[model samples]
Every structure is written in structure tokens, then in C-alpha cells.
Target: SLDNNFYSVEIGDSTFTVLKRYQNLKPIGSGAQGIVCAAYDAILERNVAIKKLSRPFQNQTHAKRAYRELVLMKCVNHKNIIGLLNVFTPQKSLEEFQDVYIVMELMDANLCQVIQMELDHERMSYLLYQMLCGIKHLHSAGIIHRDLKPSNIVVKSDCTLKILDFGLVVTRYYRAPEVILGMGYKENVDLWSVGCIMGEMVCHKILFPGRDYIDQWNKVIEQLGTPCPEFMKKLQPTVRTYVENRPKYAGYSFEKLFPDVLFPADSEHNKLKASQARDLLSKMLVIDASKRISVDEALQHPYINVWYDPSEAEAPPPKIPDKQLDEREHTIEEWKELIYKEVMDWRKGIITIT
Candidate 1:
């Protein structure tokens, strides 16, 4: 059985005697599951993010999975992936109560919080390339970032992109067909994430922003339409067979998807307008897993080529919930004021019914 002691605390190459002795600091952010704190690493004498698993997750496989993902992430070494400096268990005084803590680099903001505020094409395009670079590296290494949403991406002070949250990531659909029913997921899953992220980036609005699984798929069907034989054929037999047995449905009309919005919207300063960008994004946004664009091919597309080349273009800071937090440090309440509150307010009251 797993418990708090199942984890250990170690930094660099040294192990501290009283590890849990580190001072508690303010939180950088919080989500549905856990709270992230910007703690002072006494051993390293540096500022680090220490994420504590939620109460319910104590000593469970969730923590172990997080540990595994964190370890895997350390090997990624991509500029776009969040950097993992150190990971260890907080020193436990007693046995029985077990919890996992993750130490990672801190970030200024995330993309979903950005979309909650504004949409800038130049920034979007830049983010797109960075995401592709990161995802390509992951898939190349046989890793599939199953969860690729805006909230999962960190936007640094320089607007550099770093993917976060490997908690939901697994070897599943990223850019290929599922190998098994649910377990048959492939690389194409990453493409779906890319499509979702890109759609929101372009529109400054979520294309299929559903918190619930069923609702999430429902949103996808709404914008991109249901999966079809043409789209599913690229997948393996199991994938095709499973989807084929499901209720048949009509497909999406790309032309009608964005009525007034330009097919491939211009960047921040109207710098690049390649129709290929629009077309590629269109394919990536396809709901059918089989029809999605592969990460490698996406890199080769003209749309990406136009923006992939390095330029002096700086990505503008995306809007966050807490404009006040931009000035100085505040309590968790302060962040929630602009960050979480802002998002919840946007939801027009989506509070749980408990």
C-alpha cells in the first residue's frame, strides 16, 4: 500500500535531514485538483514551485503517475516544455498520511487565462509553432501529451511557451489512430489538443471548452462535426470498428465554422497572412481522429513555414483574470480575484450544484 512515506525528498544530489522544514510561501495558482505554491528551496537556496496533491489524491496512483510524468518531463529538455528542476518527497514526520509534492519552475501565466481576455494572431501563431516544437519532441520520444489545452501551457514573461500538467498525459491519441478502444489512443490526440488550443487562440474564445468528458466531446461535435469513415480510416482496425459501431453523424462545414473571421487570421501587426495557415488549422481542428494533421506534416505546411522562421516579433502578454496581481504580490484571494474569478465569471455562473 502507498502512503506519504512512499515519496521521498531529495534535491540535486543532496538529501536534507529536515526536508519538510522549508518555509511555506504564497500560491502561484490553483486548479480543480491541487494548489501550486511558490516555495523557497532552502537546500538549493532558490525559488521553486512545489505542487501538493489534493487531499483525496493522498498516497494514490495519481501521485505516482505525477511522479512518473515529472521524471519523463525532465528528459524532454525542450524550450517549450516546462522545466523540471527538482522532485522529491517532503519529509514526513510520521507514517500513514501520504501525499506527493512536485517541484517545478515557476511561470508568469497560462494560455487559457490568456484567451479569457484577448486574442492576438501574431502571439497565437508564435504559440502554435512553439507548441508544435514541444509536441513533436514529445511524440518523437514516444511520449504523447494527451492533455494539450491552454491552461496546460505556460506563458512566461518573455511570452515563451511551456507546456504544463502531465497529469492527464498518457500513451494515447496524439497524431495517430487508437491502437485499442480507449487504450488504442494514438498521437492524433495531441492534434486534437492543438486544434482546441489553436481555435481558442485564433478566436480568443474556446472552441470546445467543456470540463465534463461527454460535454467536451459534445462541443467538439458542435464545431468540427462527428467522426466519419473518411476521418476514421487513418486509424487502426479497432479504432475504426469501435467508432463505426457508434451512432453515425454528419460532419462539420468549415466555411460556415467562421462566417466573418478570416480563414487564416492575420498576426498581431498583420505581418503574415498565408492561406495555408488557415487550411492547416482547419485540418487540425477536424473532430474525426483519423482526419487530423500529423505534427510532422504540420511543421512542413506553408502556414507554419511563414511564422516558423525566427523574427523580432514579440508575443504580447495575454489577458489574465487578476489585473491587480500584475502590480504586486497578494494572497491566494488576490490571484483568485483576477485569475479564477475572472474565468468563473466568464462562465456566467457554472458553479457546482453541491
Candidate 2:
């Protein structure tokens, strides 16, 4: 315990306490779940992100998110999925464990920053491929990253993209149409978010810029056109009526929506086409849930297939407790207990989720 030099920072109304091994804590960002900071790990000798989840137990939903995010981070072992460097809490007992801190590998910039920089077709396709591979791993483990966006993705100088921040309805722009339309959802919903992210990456703008849910739907239909009658038949009555009565749109062609000009000039030797890229986007951006592309299918598409490596795209998926957690219907107290046990187990060893 000799090196247990500890320090605390007043992060707004909350206290961020950590062991002295991590130095020079500085705030970076905040979100629905927690606030984040960048720190240097003296032992690991690397910059890391410390996510301080304050008031994690304020309610059942927050408690579940804390537990779920930690479990998924600790269990997953994919290169494109962010790794968990460490997990801790300043409190000595479960009763006082309202605060949880997670340490993760720091990356140069999130896609939000990358969105501004000019990128060629090669870089864009490669980055999107990595996201698909990481996403494939998560889906393989039976987990869907319901929230996928530029902000939730990070990249290094080498252009390696890693996905993070498992929260949301979440971001209005990346949110799937079915989610807003009040329809049944499945893993394909994530593809919708991926589509929005890709659109933003290519166009340097939000695909469905919306002021709220109402405007969100308008932006979607205006651009993509309303779903077909067959697709809309399943919507709830009132939702269907409102959508049916809304001005109909023919939408723009994929060629028009994402023209050759918006893309980085293609390479002759490499042979990746803006046409194929648009085709893939057309499949992913579909408002009809029935027609959206699957992760496995996306891996095979021409635009992303060049970098396809089975070791990553088809690696053994992490054995996650997605089913157990999905149906357990546990209360906040039960979730907190499980989280406590998971943290203590993680502290004692490398991996655990029970």
C-alpha cells in the first residue's frame, strides 16, 4: 500500500478520486452516463481515459448502464473494440460504491475530429471496415451497440478505429427510423446508426439533422422518402396516420445523395469505387427495417471486403451475458450487487462477468 498515494479533483458537483499511479487528470468530455478525463498511468506509462461514473446508483437505469458498460468492456477482446485498462472505486464497501471509474486506452481523436479532416476513399473505406469488424464481434457475442456514431468511435494516428460509449436512444441523428417510428427493433437497428455515421463521415454533415423527434422524422423522410405501404403497414395506428398524412417524398437517388464529387478521388491500382460505397450506404441507410443490411453481410460488400481478415472479422466472439442481462429484470439493488462482485473479481484478476 506504500504507493497508494491518492488524490481527488472537484469535477463540478462530483468528486473524482483515484490512486496516485494516474497523474495529471484533465477533463475531456461528458455524456449521459458519466464525465471523462485523460490521465497518464505512471505504471503503464501511457495516456488513458478515466470515465468517472458519478451517481451510478441514482436509479435502476443508471445502475444497469454502469454494470452493462463495464461488463461488456471487460469481456470483449477485439482490436477495434476499446480495451478496459482498469476499473476501480474509491469506496471500500458496496454501500458507498456510488462512484465507479473505468480506465481505457487513450486514442488520438474520435471520429468527430476525423470528420473535419479530408479523407480519401481508401481511408474512409478502411475506417468503416474496422467499425464493421468491431461491430461484427459485438453482434457475434449477441450484443448490439444500439448507439453508434462518430462521437462513439475513436481513431489513432495509424487510422485504427475503436468504438466506445454504449449509451443512447440515444443520439437523435444516428437513431434508427424504427426507433423513432415506434416499431419493433433488432440488431439491424445498429446498421441504421452505422449508415448515419458513414453519411456524416462522407458529407461532413449530419444525415438527419433534427431539432427533435418530430423534426428528426421529417429530416429522414424528406431525404430518404417515406417508407413503402408494405413497410408502414406495421406501424402503430396513430403513428401510421401521422406519417401517412405527412407530405410524401420521392427522395434523392444514392448517386445524387452521395455523388462522386463528395468522395476522395479513387485510386486506379486500388479499384475501390464510390459507386460501390454508395450501394453499401443505400443498403445500410434503409428506413425499412426488413431491408437493412446485417453486419455479416456488410463485411462481404465490395467496398469493405478488400481489408477483410477472418482473424478479426470472424474471430471467436466474446462470451457475453447479453441474454441473462436482457431478460433478468433485476432491480437496481440486484444490479449494484452484481456490479460490485464484478469489480472485485476484476480487481483480483483479468476478466469476469457474473
Candidate 3:
């Protein structure tokens, strides 16, 4: 929501520039928390994307956390993870640091954007496989990327896959149904997100639509079930896993969450059916984390082997139309000049995620 406001950049005391009025770069894509600007780099003679953190939540503590992210990203160099070229934050006080966080890198695009643009099923599968490979690397390293969504997946110009956004990621989902009962979730939570991403890819829409937390729980339970054996296994029946939450509102059920099954009547869409699509979907959305396919198992699946390849990944830059190139270039320079002149005003803001 903070992204809706004017995007600002300041170079010095007198300089200020807003995204809308800038000349060089244009906004091709954005997310809930930040904007990705496509800008020209005269020195490099190329286009690059600059990810700026929304600045309403900046504080000394948050600033330090961001610094940690920068270091973590720098240390992570797997092909599937997004590469960090450079990080820029204000040298000014904590106040200025809160409003500005910049990550500069080559301008490819997100996987969702690429899929929508190309609409090639084969290509989609290949990219999805690459994404899984990235996840595989994380898992092998004992890291769980809890937030696995299409928007967080970046595709370079040559079709290379990179995972982005680590802010909300956590360890795992509880093995038993205790996850619903307020037990802290673990790494397998990433598997749930992966399932959601797979569902989104297949349907070209968000698979789970919920108005609130209860709605989200109902949606998942309806599609699969609570403490699904496929996702988890209880060693014995006497050990209770489900934690009753008194706060859960009444009238919640899977059928009620999605009254109209979006993929009804199509037996092929069912996960267990063994069709290419079904197999991938089933592996991703299984209810029991134990029975659910791990990243390694998913990689070994036929759909993945036949469709996706990580070694072949490469990102090609977007081609700018010759006619608009000059105009866009001019815009970038003008914006830079203004930012250099009015930076003080730009420094006075905070960026909070909550």
C-alpha cells in the first residue's frame, strides 16, 4: 500500500525527483511492498532494475535488519536465487534509511510476468522446474523459504530463474496438526506456498482466495484436509495434534470456502491422476508434509525431469522500442538531476512492513 505514493530519490540537499515525473526509467512491474524501476545505465549501456523498499517503516532496528538481508543475499550465490549486484541505502540518519532501500541488478522480469507475456506451457514448466531447483538449493542448505510465490520468482532475459523476497520466510510447518493449533510453523510451510504457486500457474489465477485467516484455513482444508496423511503422519492415534482455537469463527468449511470448485468436471486436473499437470499439482499441494513430496522428490518426478532444466537458465534483457528509447533515456537523466537537488525532503520518511 505504501507503494501507491510517489516514489522519491534524492542526491543532495537541493535535489529531489519523483518516479512519475522522471525521464529515464519506467515502471514495468511492482508488488505489495516495493516498485521495480527499469532504468538505463549509460556507463554500462544497458537497462537494469532497481528494487526500492517502501520507506514508511524505517527505524534503527529495521535498518539493521535490512543490512543483514543485504549480507545474506550477497552470500547466497546459487543460480536459482536472485543475484545481488549492488545495495544502496542512505549514509544519512536512521530516518533517511527507513525510506530508501535499493538493489540494482540486470533487468529481466518476474516469472509470473514472463508466463503472462509468453503463455508457453513448455516454457512455463521449464521455468517452474528451475524455480524448484532453486528451492532445492535452499533445502539442501537447510534454509526454508516460507514465502514462495510467483511474484517472488524473477526470470532473467535468458530465462534464468531467481527467487526473491525473504522477509516473511520461516523454518517449517509442524509435522502434526498442531500447526493449526498455534504451534510455530517450520520449513514445510514453503511447500504449501509452492503448492499455491503451482496452482496459480496451472489456473493462471490465485488458487486460494481468502478474506481472512479463517478463510485461508478453510480453503486449504477444503481442497485437501487438516493434518492430511499425505503431508504428515501421526505415529499413534492417541497423541492429539489438532489444537482447538477458541477464536476460530464458526461457519468455516472447505466446501463453504469455495462453493464452486473452479476445476470441477475435469478429472485430469485432479492431483493423483498422473497427467503431467496433475502430477505436478499433487506433489505440490499434498496435505501431509511427511507424505508430501520433498523438493528432492519433486525434482525426480517425471514432469520436472521432462520439462525443466536449471543449467540452461539465462536471463535476456527486455528489448526497448527504438522510438521510445531516446525519450526514456532523457527522462532518466532529468530525474537524476532533480533528485540530486532536492534530496532532503526525500530523506524525511519511514517504510514499515506492518
**Model 2 regions lying over 4 Å from their true place:** 1-3, 167-170, 265-270, 321-324, 350-354
TM-score of each: 0.65, 0.93, 0.62
* lDDT of prediction 2: 0.84
Model 3 residue 68 CA deviation in Å: 4.2
Better of 1 and 3 by lDDT: 1
Backbone clashes, candidate 2: 0
Candidate 1 RMSD to the real structure:
15.1
Candidate ranking (TM-score, best to worst): 2, 1, 3
Query: For model 1, how does the per-residue alpha-carbon lDDT over 215-237 read when each residue is reduced to its tens digit?
Result: 55555555565666566666567
Model 1 is weakest, by summed lDDT over 10 consecutive residues, at 311-320
Give the winner by TM-score: 1 or 3.
1
Model 2 worst lDDT window (10 residues): 165-174
Model 2 residue 188 CA deviation (Å) reads 1.7
Evaluated against the true structure, the overall lDDT of model 3 is: 0.51
Off by over 4 Å in 1: 1-24, 40-47, 54-60, 92-97, 167-183, 230-251, 259-269, 307-354
